[PDB]
Design a protein around this motif. Structure first.
Motif, PDB file in Angstrom:
ATOM      1  N   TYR A  73       8.362   1.084  -4.572  1.00  0.00           N
ATOM      2  CA  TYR A  73       9.247   1.033  -3.425  1.00  0.00           C
ATOM      3  C   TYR A  73       9.111  -0.237  -2.619  1.00  0.00           C
ATOM      4  CZ  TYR A  73      10.596   5.823  -4.048  1.00  0.00           C
ATOM      5  OH  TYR A  73      11.108   6.989  -4.531  1.00  0.00           O
ATOM      6  N   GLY A  74       8.434  -1.250  -3.146  1.00  0.00           N
ATOM      7  CA  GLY A  74       8.323  -2.521  -2.462  1.00  0.00           C
ATOM      8  C   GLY A  74       7.533  -2.495  -1.179  1.00  0.00           C
ATOM      9  N   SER A  75       6.562  -1.593  -1.062  1.00  0.00           N
ATOM     10  CA  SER A  75       5.776  -1.476   0.158  1.00  0.00           C
ATOM     11  C   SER A  75       4.828  -2.643   0.363  1.00  0.00           C
ATOM     12  CB  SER A  75       4.973  -0.187   0.134  1.00  0.00           C
ATOM     13  OG  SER A  75       5.784   0.916   0.464  1.00  0.00           O
ATOM     14  N   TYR A  76       4.585  -3.437  -0.672  1.00  0.00           N
ATOM     15  CA  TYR A  76       3.719  -4.596  -0.595  1.00  0.00           C
ATOM     16  C   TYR A  76       4.345  -5.769   0.133  1.00  0.00           C
ATOM     17  CZ  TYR A  76       6.601  -5.657  -4.647  1.00  0.00           C
ATOM     18  OH  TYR A  76       7.646  -5.848  -5.501  1.00  0.00           O
ATOM     19  N   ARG A  77       5.626  -5.703   0.466  1.00  0.00           N
ATOM     20  CA  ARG A  77       6.392  -6.893   0.801  1.00  0.00           C
ATOM     21  C   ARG A  77       6.111  -7.348   2.225  1.00  0.00           C
ATOM     22  NH1 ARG A  77      11.371  -8.457  -2.106  1.00  0.00           N
ATOM     23  NH2 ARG A  77      12.264  -8.855  -0.043  1.00  0.00           N
ATOM     24  N   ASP A 111       7.632 -11.388  -6.090  1.00  0.00           N
ATOM     25  CA  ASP A 111       8.834 -10.583  -5.918  1.00  0.00           C
ATOM     26  C   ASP A 111       9.897 -11.442  -5.259  1.00  0.00           C
ATOM     27  OD1 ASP A 111      10.417  -8.413  -6.117  1.00  0.00           O
ATOM     28  OD2 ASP A 111       9.659  -7.428  -4.315  1.00  0.00           O
ATOM     29  N   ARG A 112      10.892 -11.864  -6.036  1.00  0.00           N
ATOM     30  CA  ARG A 112      11.855 -12.868  -5.610  1.00  0.00           C
ATOM     31  C   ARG A 112      13.205 -12.280  -5.239  1.00  0.00           C
ATOM     32  NH1 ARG A 112      10.742 -17.432  -3.643  1.00  0.00           N
ATOM     33  NH2 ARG A 112      12.406 -18.598  -4.707  1.00  0.00           N
ATOM     34  N   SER A 113      13.251 -11.064  -4.722  1.00  0.00           N
ATOM     35  CA  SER A 113      14.538 -10.445  -4.472  1.00  0.00           C
ATOM     36  C   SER A 113      14.678 -10.081  -3.008  1.00  0.00           C
ATOM     37  CB  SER A 113      14.752  -9.202  -5.328  1.00  0.00           C
ATOM     38  OG  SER A 113      13.889  -8.168  -4.918  1.00  0.00           O
ATOM     39  N   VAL A 114      15.934  -9.924  -2.597  1.00  0.00           N
ATOM     40  CA  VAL A 114      16.271  -9.785  -1.193  1.00  0.00           C
ATOM     41  C   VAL A 114      16.297  -8.343  -0.728  1.00  0.00           C
ATOM     42  CG1 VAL A 114      17.613 -11.841  -1.508  1.00  0.00           C
ATOM     43  CG2 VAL A 114      18.729  -9.671  -1.572  1.00  0.00           C
ATOM     44  N   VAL A 115      16.281  -7.378  -1.637  1.00  0.00           N
ATOM     45  CA  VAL A 115      16.262  -5.970  -1.277  1.00  0.00           C
ATOM     46  C   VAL A 115      14.936  -5.387  -1.731  1.00  0.00           C
ATOM     47  CG1 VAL A 115      18.752  -5.784  -1.317  1.00  0.00           C
ATOM     48  CG2 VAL A 115      17.520  -5.264  -3.338  1.00  0.00           C
ATOM     49  N   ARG A 116      14.390  -4.495  -0.927  1.00  0.00           N
ATOM     50  CA  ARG A 116      13.029  -4.019  -1.097  1.00  0.00           C
ATOM     51  C   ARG A 116      13.027  -2.737  -1.913  1.00  0.00           C
ATOM     52  NH1 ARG A 116      10.957  -2.793   4.496  1.00  0.00           N
ATOM     53  NH2 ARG A 116      11.101  -5.073   4.435  1.00  0.00           N
ATOM     54  N   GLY A 117      12.333  -2.753  -3.042  1.00  0.00           N
ATOM     55  CA  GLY A 117      12.162  -1.570  -3.858  1.00  0.00           C
ATOM     56  C   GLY A 117      13.065  -1.572  -5.073  1.00  0.00           C
ATOM     57  N   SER A 121     -12.352  12.421  -9.668  1.00  0.00           N
ATOM     58  CA  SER A 121     -11.290  12.072 -10.609  1.00  0.00           C
ATOM     59  C   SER A 121      -9.902  12.341 -10.029  1.00  0.00           C
ATOM     60  CB  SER A 121     -11.488  12.822 -11.917  1.00  0.00           C
ATOM     61  OG  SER A 121     -10.514  12.454 -12.863  1.00  0.00           O
ATOM     62  N   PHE A 122      -9.775  13.349  -9.173  1.00  0.00           N
ATOM     63  CA  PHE A 122      -8.494  13.633  -8.543  1.00  0.00           C
ATOM     64  C   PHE A 122      -8.158  12.612  -7.477  1.00  0.00           C
ATOM     65  CE2 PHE A 122      -6.642  18.010  -9.086  1.00  0.00           C
ATOM     66  CZ  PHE A 122      -6.823  17.933 -10.436  1.00  0.00           C
ATOM     67  N   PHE A 123      -9.173  12.164  -6.742  1.00  0.00           N
ATOM     68  CA  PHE A 123      -9.072  11.036  -5.830  1.00  0.00           C
ATOM     69  C   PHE A 123      -8.515   9.812  -6.538  1.00  0.00           C
ATOM     70  CE2 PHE A 123     -10.721   8.865  -2.056  1.00  0.00           C
ATOM     71  CZ  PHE A 123     -10.950   7.621  -2.516  1.00  0.00           C
ATOM     72  N   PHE A 124      -8.955   9.555  -7.772  1.00  0.00           N
ATOM     73  CA  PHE A 124      -8.426   8.380  -8.467  1.00  0.00           C
ATOM     74  C   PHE A 124      -7.023   8.594  -9.012  1.00  0.00           C
ATOM     75  CE2 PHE A 124     -12.869   7.002  -9.151  1.00  0.00           C
ATOM     76  CZ  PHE A 124     -12.832   6.312  -7.968  1.00  0.00           C
ATOM     77  N   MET A 125      -6.676   9.813  -9.432  1.00  0.00           N
ATOM     78  CA  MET A 125      -5.293  10.031  -9.864  1.00  0.00           C
ATOM     79  C   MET A 125      -4.325   9.904  -8.696  1.00  0.00           C
ATOM     80  SD  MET A 125      -3.734  10.293 -12.641  1.00  0.00           S
ATOM     81  CE  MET A 125      -1.972  10.097 -12.773  1.00  0.00           C
ATOM     82  N   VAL A 126      -4.689  10.458  -7.541  1.00  0.00           N
ATOM     83  CA  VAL A 126      -3.869  10.322  -6.346  1.00  0.00           C
ATOM     84  C   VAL A 126      -3.832   8.875  -5.863  1.00  0.00           C
ATOM     85  CG1 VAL A 126      -3.679  11.116  -3.975  1.00  0.00           C
ATOM     86  CG2 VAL A 126      -4.150  12.688  -5.717  1.00  0.00           C
ATOM     87  N   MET A 127      -4.924   8.128  -6.021  1.00  0.00           N
ATOM     88  CA  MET A 127      -4.912   6.728  -5.619  1.00  0.00           C
ATOM     89  C   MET A 127      -4.036   5.890  -6.541  1.00  0.00           C
ATOM     90  SD  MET A 127      -8.201   4.403  -5.035  1.00  0.00           S
ATOM     91  CE  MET A 127      -8.283   5.054  -3.400  1.00  0.00           C
ATOM     92  N   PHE A 128      -4.003   6.221  -7.831  1.00  0.00           N
ATOM     93  CA  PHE A 128      -3.074   5.553  -8.733  1.00  0.00           C
ATOM     94  C   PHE A 128      -1.630   5.878  -8.385  1.00  0.00           C
ATOM     95  CE2 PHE A 128      -6.383   5.199 -12.238  1.00  0.00           C
ATOM     96  CZ  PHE A 128      -6.620   3.900 -11.904  1.00  0.00           C
ATOM     97  N   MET A 129      -1.369   7.099  -7.919  1.00  0.00           N
ATOM     98  CA  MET A 129      -0.012   7.433  -7.492  1.00  0.00           C
ATOM     99  C   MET A 129       0.376   6.702  -6.213  1.00  0.00           C
ATOM    100  SD  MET A 129       0.274  11.471  -8.291  1.00  0.00           S
ATOM    101  CE  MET A 129       0.229  12.053  -9.967  1.00  0.00           C
ATOM    102  N   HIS A 130      -0.569   6.551  -5.282  1.00  0.00           N
ATOM    103  CA  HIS A 130      -0.346   5.796  -4.049  1.00  0.00           C
ATOM    104  C   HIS A 130      -0.011   4.343  -4.351  1.00  0.00           C
ATOM    105  CE1 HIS A 130      -0.701   5.433   0.287  1.00  0.00           C
ATOM    106  NE2 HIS A 130      -1.643   4.509   0.206  1.00  0.00           N
ATOM    107  N   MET A 131      -0.747   3.736  -5.273  1.00  0.00           N
ATOM    108  CA  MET A 131      -0.468   2.351  -5.626  1.00  0.00           C
ATOM    109  C   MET A 131       0.827   2.213  -6.417  1.00  0.00           C
ATOM    110  SD  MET A 131      -4.350   1.423  -6.599  1.00  0.00           S
ATOM    111  CE  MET A 131      -3.731   0.036  -7.514  1.00  0.00           C
ATOM    112  N   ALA A 132       1.149   3.188  -7.266  1.00  0.00           N
ATOM    113  CA  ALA A 132       2.369   3.087  -8.057  1.00  0.00           C
ATOM    114  C   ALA A 132       3.603   3.307  -7.198  1.00  0.00           C
ATOM    115  CB  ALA A 132       2.335   4.081  -9.206  1.00  0.00           C
TER     116      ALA A 132
END
Ligand SMILES: CCCCCCCCCCCCCCCCCC(=O)OC[C@H](COP(=O)([O-])OCC(O)COP(=O)([O-])OC[C@@H](COC(=O)CCCCCCCCCCCCCCCCC)OC(=O)CCCCCCCCCCCCCCCCC)OC(=O)CCCCCCCCCCCCCCCCC
Ligand SMILES: CCCCCCCCCCCCCCCCCC(=O)OC[C@H](COP(=O)([O-])OCC(O)COP(=O)([O-])OC[C@@H](COC(=O)CCCCCCCCCCCCCCCCC)OC(=O)CCCCCCCCCCCCCCCCC)OC(=O)CCCCCCCCCCCCCCCCC
Ligand SMILES: CCCCCCCCCCCCCCCC(=O)OC[C@H](COP(=O)([O-])OCC[N+](C)(C)C)OC(=O)CCCCCCCCCCCCCCC
Ligand SMILES: CCCCCCCCCCCCCCCC(=O)OC[C@H](COP(=O)([O-])OCC[N+](C)(C)C)OC(=O)CCCCCCCCCCCCCCC
Ligand SMILES: CCCCCCCCCCCCCCCC(=O)OC[C@H](COP(=O)(O)OCCN)OC(=O)CCCCCCCCCCCCCCC
Ligand SMILES: CCCCCCCCCCCCCCCC(=O)OC[C@H](COP(=O)(O)OCCN)OC(=O)CCCCCCCCCCCCCCC
Ligand SMILES: CCCCCCCCCCCCCCCC(=O)OC[C@H](COP(=O)(O)OCCN)OC(=O)CCCCCCCCCCCCCCC
Ligand SMILES: CCCCCCCCCCCCCCCC(=O)OC[C@H](COP(=O)(O)OCCN)OC(=O)CCCCCCCCCCCCCCC
Ligand code: HEC
Ligand code: HEM
Ligand code: HEM
Lengths: 247, 93, 62, 75, 385, 57
Positions: E103-107, E309-315, E87-98
C-alpha cells in the motif's frame, strides 16, 4: 541425498491417540513399561522420568514403590564420611543400565544407545517411526548392500545400517493381562509408553485445548457481531452533494 | 511545550483537508438498525465479485512458482535415483 | 434534491423499533462477550500464578 | 499359538496382483546383482549395483497396505 | 476540558488509542500492528515466567527447559506459547511489512516510520536467534556455530570478533549465558523502538488502501477500531490456541529434543522457518564474506524502497503491473524459504541463486521500471493529443 | 416485560457487571465439569480408572 540415505518413510498407523479428542491407552502404557523393563532397559536409559510420574498413569502407588525399592541409589554419606547406598523412593529417577558413556560404548560395540525419554519427539515421524523401526528388520538385507560387521539392516533408519539388532521376538514377554504378546503388540506397547514418556501432559493438554477452542470460537463470533453492531452507523452512512453556488 | 514542524494531519477541528461545502451526511442509530443485514447475500455474491476481480494477480505467480518447485523437486528425485545416476555424475562432476 | 429529504434507509432499518428490546439484545450480546472474556482472563492469570507456585519435585520432597 | 500380525499381513499383501510384480522386479534385480558378484574381479568396479530401490518400492507398497488395518488386529 | 485530555498520562493514552483519528477506509490489514503489540506482550510475559525456572549453564539449559515442561505447573503451556507465539509474531510481522510495501506506506511522509520498522525487524530477528540458541538442542548449537562462524569471513578482525562472541573458542557455557542475558535484553530495546515507531506514526497518521488523503472523513479510534481490532485479536488467539494445544511441535524441528552435542553434526543444519529465506540468500553466494554482506543487504534493501518507487500515486490498489510483480515477489520469498530448508543439491543452488536475484531485482530494477511505465500509461490513457 | 428486563439488568452498570461476574463464575464451574465428563466418556476404557478397575476385577 538418495532414498537410502534419507531412510524409508514410516506409514501412518492408526494409533489410539491420533486425533484431537483422544487419549493414551493407559493399559498400553502399562504393558509398554513391562516391555521396556524386560527388554529395553538393558541398553537404553530413561533419565527424565521420575518414579512418581508413573503413579496414577500406569501403576498403583505401592506398585511403583516396590519397583523403586528394587533399585539402589547413592545415599548421603554416614557419620564417618563413608559413602552409603539407599533403596529408591518415589522422588528418584529411573536409572540407566550404564554408569557412563564409555561403559555404554564399550558394551554395545562402539555405538551409544540414545536415552529414550524424548525419542518420539526427537525423531521425524514419531510413533510411526519407532514402531516401524522396531518391526522393520528384514530377515536378510537386500541383495547388493555391504553391511559392516556388527551392524544390522533396517531401512527406516537413515542410511540403513543400525547398530541395534532385532530385539523384539514373539512371546518373549508374558503380559499380566493375558494379551498375546507378539512382536507387533510389544512394539505398539513400547511406542505408546515412549510417547507417554516424551509427552506426559498429553491428555490434559488436549482437554484444555477443547476448552480454549470452544471459548475462543464463541468469543470470535460474538466479537464479529459486536463489531458489526458498532460499525452499523458508519457502514450505512449516506453522502449527498449539492454543488454550492458560485460566490 | 515547544511547537513542532508542519505535519499532514491535525486534530479534531484543524485536520488540514480542503474546505468542504455542500456535502450532507445522514446516518441512523445502530440500535435502530439490523446488524448482520445482507450477510447471506454478500457472502456469496460480493465474495464472488471480489474473487473474480482479484485472483489472476494471486494465482498466476502462485502457479508459476508452484510449477517451478514441482519441476525442480522432480528433477532432484530423479537425479538421486538409480535410473538417473549418469546425469547426476555428469551434472556435479 | 433538497437536504430535508433524507435517503432510503429501509433495507437496513428494523421495522419494530422498541427501545428496550433492541437495547437488551445488544447488551445481552456484549454481556456474553464480557462474561466469556472475564472467565478467560481469570483463567490466564491463574495459569501464570500457578506457574509460579511450586514444582513437582519440590512437592515430591515434601 | 498366535503368529505376528504384521508378517501375516505382509505375506497376504505379497500374495496379491501387483505385489507379485514388485516382488518379481526385486528378484530380477537380486539375481542380476549376484551374477554380477560372481564375475571375476568384482571388488574393483568402483560402483556396485544394489537392489535397495526395488526393496523400497516393495516395502512402500507393503507399508501403505498393512498400515491402516494392523491396529484392528492388535489389542 | 475532559480529564482524559487534562492529564499527563491519560493525555498520551487518549491521543494514541482513544481519540486517534483514523481514516475510515482502512481494511483488516491495519490490525497487524495491534496484533504485533499483543504478540510482544505475550512473549515478554511468558518469557519472564519461564526465566523464573530457566538455568543458563551449558550443562543445565536443556534439562531446565524440560524441567519447565515436566515439573512446572502449566509450564508446557508457557513453553509452547512462547515458541509458537514467537513464530506467530514473525508471521504477523511479515504481514505488516507486506502490507506496508503493498500500500505504499513506506513513501515520502513516512520514511522515518519505515526505517524505525526496519530497525525493529533486525532486532526481532536477533532476539529470536538468541532465544533459539538458549534452549541448546542440536539445531540450536549447530545453528549458533554456523551463524557465528559467518563472522570469521571479515579478513582482518574476524577471528577476534568471533572469539569475542563465543567467549572462548566455540559455543559453550559463556556463549549460552551471554545469549540468555542478551535474549532477555533486546526485547526491551524492541519495546523502546516500538514506542518510537508509534511516535513516528503519530505525526502524520496512518495511510489508507486508496492512497489518497484520509484527512476528509476520520473516525476516533475508540469504539470503532478498538472492536475491529478485537475481532482479529480473538481470531489470532483462536489460531494460536489451536497450534499450542493440538499441534505444538509442528513448526519446530524435531532435533531440538536431542541435547546439544559438539561432536555429532545433525546432517542438515537449518534454523527456524522464518529465517530460512535469509539463510537461502546467504547460502546462494559462493563466498562467505559476500554471503553475509548479501544477507545484510537483503534486509537493508528495504531502505532503498522510498527512493526507487518512481510513481505519483501511492500503493498498488490501482495498478495492474505493480500487483502482478508484487505477488511474484511474495511467492519468490516463499520459494526462497523453501529452498533454505533443502540440501545443497543440484537444482536447488540454481533455484536459490535465481530467486535471490529476483529478490534484489524487485527493489532495484522492477519497482522503478514498472513505476515509470505505469506513470506514462496513466498519462496517455486519459490525455488527448 | 422487556422494560422490566431492562430496568432490572441493563440499566445500572453496577448490576450489569455484577451479573457478568456471577455468570462467569457459574459458567466456569459447569463448563469445566461438562468438558471433563464429555472427555472422559469419549475416552472410555482408556483412562487409568478403567484399567484400575480391570486389574482389580
Ligand atoms: C461466512 C463467511 C462469509 O462469507 O462472511 C462474509 C460476510 C459478508 O462479507 P462482506 O461484507 O462482503 O465482507 C466484508 C469484509 O470481508 C468483512 O466485513 P466485516 O468486518 O463487516 O465482517 C467481519 C468479518 C471478520 O472476519 C475477518 O475479518 C477475519 C479474516 C477472515 C478470516 C477467514 C477465516 C476464518 C477461519 C476461522 C476458523 C479458523 O466477518 C467474517 O468474515 C466472518 C468469517 C467467519 C467464517 C466462519 C463463519 C462460521 C459461522 C458459523 O460476513 C458475514 O457473513 C458475517 C457472519 C458472522 C455472523 C456472526 C454472528 C455471531 C452470532 C453470535 C454467535 C454466538 C456464539 C455462541 C454464544 C454462546 C453464548 C454463551
Ligand atoms: C477462505 C478463503 C477466502 C476466499 C473468499 C473470500 C472472498 C474473496 O474472494 O476475497 C478476495 C479478497 C480480495 O478482496 P478485496 O476486497 O479486493 O481485498 C481488500 C482487502 O484485501 C481485504 O479487505 P477486508 O477488510 O475485506 O479484509 C478482510 C479479509 C482479510 O483479513 C485479514 O487479512 C486478516 C488476516 C488474519 C488476521 C489474524 C491473523 C492470525 C495470525 C496467524 C496467521 C496464520 C496464517 O478477510 C476476509 O476476506 C473476510 C471475508 C471472507 C468471506 C469468506 C467467503 C467464503 C466463501 C463462502 O482477498 C482476501 O479477502 C484475502 C483474505 C482471505 C483470508 C482467508 C483465508
Ligand atoms: C449457493 C447459492 C445460494 C444463494 C443464497 C443466497 O444468495 O441468499 C439470498 C438471501 C440472502 O438474504 P440476506 O443476506 O438476509 O439479505 C436480506 C435482504 N433481503 C433478501 C431481505 C431483501 O437468502 C437467505 O436469506 C439465506 C438465508 C438462509 C441460509 C442459511 C444457511 C445456509
Ligand atoms: C478483563 C476483561 C473484563 C471484561 C468485563 C466486561 C464487562 O463487564 O463489560 C461491562 C461494561 C459494559 O459497558 P457498556 O457496554 O458501555 O454498558 C454501559 C452500561 N449500560 C449502557 C448498559 C447502562 O464494560 C465496561 O464497563 C468496561 C470494561 C473494560 C475492560
Ligand atoms: C509484463 C507481463 C504481463 C504482466 C501483466 C499481467 C497482468 C494480468 C492481469 C489480468 C487481470 O487483471 O484480470 C483481472 C480481471 C478483473 O475483472 P474486472 O472485475 O475488472 O472485470 C471488469 C469487466 N467489465 O479479471 C477478469 O477480467 C476476468 C477473468 C476471467 C478469466 C476466465
Ligand atoms: C498480559 C497477559 C497476556 C497473555 C495472553 C495469553 C492469551 C494468548 C492466547 C493463547 C491461548 C489462550 C490462553 C492459553 C492459556 C490458558 O490459560 O488457557 C486455558 C483456559 C482454560 O483453562 P482452565 O481455566 O481450565 O485452567 C487453566 C490451567 N489451570 O482457556 C481459556 O479460557 C482461553 C481464553 C483466553 C482469553 C484471553 C483473554 C486475555 C486475558 C489477558 C489477561
Ligand atoms: C473507579 C472509580 C474512579 C473514579 C471515578 C471516576 O471514574 O471519575 C470519572 C472521571 C471524570 O472525568 P470527567 O471527564 O467527567 O472530568 C470532569 C472534571 N471536571 O473520568 C475519568 O476518570 C477518565 C477515565 C478515562 C479512561 C481511560 C482508560 C484508559 C485505558 C488504558 C489504561 C492505560 C493502559 C496503558 C498500557
Ligand atoms: C502496541 C500498540 C497497539 C495500539 C492499539 C491498541 C488498541 C487495543 C487493541 C486490543 C483490543 C482491546 C479491547 C478493549 C475493549 C474495551 O476496553 O472497550 C471498552 C468498552 C467501552 O464501550 P463503549 O464506550 O463503546 O460503550 C457504549 C455505551 N457505553 O466497554 C465494553 O464494551 C466492554 C465489552 C467487553 C470487552 C471485553 C474485552 C476483552 C479483551 C480481551 C483481550 C485484551 C487484549
Ligand atoms: C541392546 C544393546 C539394545 C536393546 C535391547 C535395545 N536397543 Fe535400541 N539401540 C541400541 C543401540 C546400540 C542403538 C544405536 C544404534 C545407532 O546406530 O544409533 C540403538 C538405537 C535406538 C533408537 C534410535 C534409532 C535412531 O536414531 O533412529 C531407538 C528409538 C531405540 N534404539 C529404541 C529401542 C526400543 C524402543 C527398544 C525396546 C525393547 C530397544 N531400543 C532395544 C541398543 C539396544
Ligand atoms: C521479542 C520477543 C521474543 C521473541 C521473539 C522470543 C523468541 C524466542 C524463541 C524463538 C525462543 C525459542 C523457543 C523454542 O524453540 O523453544 C525463545 C526461547 C526463550 N525465550 Fe524468548 N523471545 C522473546 C521474548 C523473551 C523474553 C523477554 C524473555 C525473558 C524474559 C524470553 C525468555 C526466553 C526463554 C527463557 C527461552 C528459553 C527456551 C524456552 O523455554 O523455550 N523471551 N524465545
Ligand atoms: C514489534 C513490531 C511492530 C509493532 C508493534 C508495530 C506497530 C505498528 C502499529 C501499531 C502500526 C499502526 C497500525 C497499522 O498501520 O497497522 C504500525 C504501522 C506501521 N508499521 Fe509497524 N510495527 C512493528 C513492526 C514494523 C515493521 C517490521 C515495519 C516495516 C519495516 C513496520 C512498518 C510500519 C509501517 C510502514 C506502518 C504504517 C502503515 C500504515 O499505516 O500505512 N512496522 N506499526
Amino acid at each position: 541425498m538418495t532414498a537410502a540415505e534419507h531412510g524409508l518413510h514410516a506409514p501412518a498407523y492408526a494409533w489410539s491417540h491420533n486425533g484431537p479428542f483422544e487419549t493414551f491407552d493407559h493399559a498400553s502404557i502399562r504393558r509398554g513399561y513391562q516391555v521396556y523393563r524386560e527388554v529395553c532397559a538393558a541398553c537404553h536409559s530413561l533419565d527424565r522420568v521420575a518414579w512418581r510420574t508413573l503413579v496414577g498413569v500406569s501403576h498403583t502407588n505401592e506398585e511403583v514403590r516396590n519397583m523403586a525399592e528394587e533399585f539402589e541409589y547413592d545415599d548421603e554419606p554416614d557419620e564417618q564420611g563413608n559413602p552409603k547406598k539407599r533403596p529408591g523412593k518415589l522422588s528418584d529417577y529411573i536409572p540407566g543400565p550404564y554408569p557412563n558413556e564409555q561403559a555404554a560404548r564399550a558394551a554395545n560395540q562402539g555405538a551409544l544407545p540414545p536415552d529414550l525419554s524424548l525419542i518420539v519427539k526427537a525423531r521425524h515421524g514419531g510413533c510411526d517411526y519407532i514402531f516401524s523401526l522396531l518391526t522393520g528388520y528384514p530377515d536378510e538385507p537386500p541383495a547388493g548392500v555391504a553391511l559392516p560387521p556388527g551392524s544390522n539392516y533396517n531401512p527406516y533408519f537413515p542410511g540403513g545400517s543400525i547398530a541395534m539388532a532385532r530385539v523384539l521376538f514373539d512371546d518373549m514377554v508374558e503380559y499380566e493381562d493375558g494379551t498375546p504378546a507378539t512382536t507387533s503388540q510389544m512394539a505398539k506397547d513400547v511406542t505408546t509408553f515412549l510417547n507417554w514418556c516424551a509427552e506426559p501432559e498429553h491428555d490434559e493438554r488436549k482437554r484444555l485445548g477443547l476448552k480454549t477452542v470452544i471459548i475462543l470460537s464463541s468469543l470470535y463470533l460474538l466479537s464479529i457481531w459486536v463489531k458489526k453492531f458498532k460499525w452499523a452507523g458508519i457502514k450505512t452512512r449516506k453522502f449527498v452533494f449539492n454543488p454550492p453556488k458560485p460566490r | 511545550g515547544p511547537p513542532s514542524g508542519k505535519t499532514y494531519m491535525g486534530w479534531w477541528g484543524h485536520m488540514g483537508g480542503p474546505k468542504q461545502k455542500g456535502i450532507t451526511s445522514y446516518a441512523v442509530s445502530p440500535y435502530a438498525q439490523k446488524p448482520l443485514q445482507g450477510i447471506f447475500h454478500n457472502a456469496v455474491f460480493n465474495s464472488f465479485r471480489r474473487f473474480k476481480s482479484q485472483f489472476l494477480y494471486v494465482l498466476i505467480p502462485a502457479g508459476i512458482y508452484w510449477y517451478w518447485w514441482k519441476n525442480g523437486n522432480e528433477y532432484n528425485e530423479f537425479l538421486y535415483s538409480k535410473a538417473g545416476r549418469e546425469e547426476l555424475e555428469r551434472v556435479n562432476v | 434534491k433538497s437536504t430535508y429529504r433524507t435517503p432510503n434507509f429501509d433495507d437496513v432499518l428494523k421495522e419494530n423499533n422498541d427501545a428496550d428490546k433492541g437495547r437488551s439484545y445488544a447488551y445481552f450480546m456484549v454481556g456474553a462477550m464480557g462474561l466469556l472474556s472475564s472467565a478467560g482472563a481469570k483463567s490466564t492469570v491463574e495459569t501464570f500464578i500457578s506457574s509460579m507456585t511450586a514444582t513437582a519435585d519440590v512437592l515430591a520432597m515434601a | 499359538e498366535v503368529t505376528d500380525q504384521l508378517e501375516d499381513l505382509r505375506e497376504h499383501f505379497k500374495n496379491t496382483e501387483e505385489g507379485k510384480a514388485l516382488v518379481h522386479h526385486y528378484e530380477e534385480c537380486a539375481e542380476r546383482v549376484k551374477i554380477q558378484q560372481q564375475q571375476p574381479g568384482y571388488a574393483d568396479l568402483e560402483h556396485k549395483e544394489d537392489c535397495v530401490e526395488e526393496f523400497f518400492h516393495l516395502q512402500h507398497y507393503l507399508d501403505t497396505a498393512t498400515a491402516p488395518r494392523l491396529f484392528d488386529k492388535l489389542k | 476540558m475532559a480529564f482524559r485530555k487534562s492529564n499527563v498520562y491519560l493525555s498520551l493514552v487518549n491521543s494514541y488509542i482513544i481519540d486517534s483519528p483514523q481514516p475510515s477506509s482502512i481494511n483488516y490489514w491495519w490490525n497487524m500492528g495491534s496484533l504485533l503489540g499483543l504478540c510482544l506482550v505475550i512473549q515478554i510475559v511468558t518469557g519472564i515466567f519461564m526465566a523464573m525456572h530457566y538455568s543458563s549453564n551449558i550443562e543445565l539449559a536443556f534439562s531446565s527447559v524440560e524441567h519447565i515442561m515436566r515439573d512446572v505447573h502449566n509450564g508446557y503451556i508457557l513453553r509452547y506459547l512462547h515458541a509458537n507465539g514467537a513464530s506467530f509474531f514473525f508471521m504477523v510481522m511479515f504481514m505488516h511489512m507486506a502490507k506496508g510495501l503493498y500500500y505504499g506506506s513506506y513513501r515520502s511522509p513516512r520514511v522515518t516510520l519505515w526505517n524505525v520498522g526496519v530497525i525493529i525487524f533486525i532486532l526481532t530477528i536477533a532476539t529470536a536467534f538468541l532465544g533459539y540458541c538458549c534452549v541448546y538442542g542440536q539445531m540450536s548449537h549447530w545453528g549458533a556455530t554456523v551463524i557465528t562462524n559467518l563472522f570469521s569471513a571479515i579478513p582482518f578482525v574476524g577471528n577476534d570478533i568471533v572469539s569475542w562472541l563465543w567467549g572462548g573458542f566455540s559455543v559453550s557455557n559463556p556463549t549460552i549465558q551471554r545469549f540468555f542475558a542478551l535474549h532477555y535484553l533486546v526485547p526491551f530495546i524492541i519495546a523502546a523502538m516500538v514506542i518510537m515507531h508509534l511516535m513516528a506514526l503519530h505525526i502524520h497518521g496512518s495511510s489508507n488502501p486508496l492512497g489518497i488523503t484520509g484527512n476528509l472523513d476520520r473516525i476516533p479510534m475508540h469504539s470503532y477500531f478498538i472492536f475491529k481490532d478485537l475481532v482479529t485479536v480473538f481470531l489470532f488467539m483462536l489460531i494460536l490456541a489451536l497450534f499450542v494445544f493440538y499441534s505444538p511441535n509442528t513448526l519446530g524441528h524435531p532435533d531440538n529434543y536431542i541435547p546439544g552435542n559438539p561432536l555429532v553434526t545433525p546432517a542438515s543444519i537449518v534454523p527456524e522457518w522464518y529465517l530460512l529465506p535469509f539463510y537461502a540468500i546467504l547460502r546462494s553466494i559462493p563466498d562467505k564474506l559476500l554471503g553475509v554482506i548479501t544477507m545484510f543487504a537483503a534486509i537493508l534493501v528495504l531502505l532503498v524502497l522510498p527512493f526507487t518507487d518512481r510513481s505519483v500515486v501511492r500503493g498498488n490498489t490501482f495498478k495492474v503491473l505493480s500487483k502482478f510483480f508484487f505477488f511474484i515477489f511474495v511467492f519468490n520469498f516463499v520459494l526462497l524459504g523453501q529452498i533454505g530448508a533443502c540440501h545443497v543439491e543440484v537444482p536447488y543452488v540454481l533455484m536459490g541463486q535465481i530467486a535471490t536475484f529476483i529478490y534484489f531485482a524487485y527493489f532495484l530494477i522492477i519497482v522503478p521500471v514498472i513505476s515509470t511505465i505505469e506513470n506514462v500509461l496513466f498519462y496517455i490513457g486519459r490525455v488527448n493529443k | 416485560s422487556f422494560s422490566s428486563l431492562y430496568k432490572t439488568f441493563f440499566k445500572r452498570n453496577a448490576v450489569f457487571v455484577g451479573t457478568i461476574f456471577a455468570g462467569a463464575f457459574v459458567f466456569q464451574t459447569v463448563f469445566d465439569t461438562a468438558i471433563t465428563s464429555w472427555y472422559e466418556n469419549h475416552n472410555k476404557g482408556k483412562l487409568w480408572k478403567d484399567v484400575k478397575a480391570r486389574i482389580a476385577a
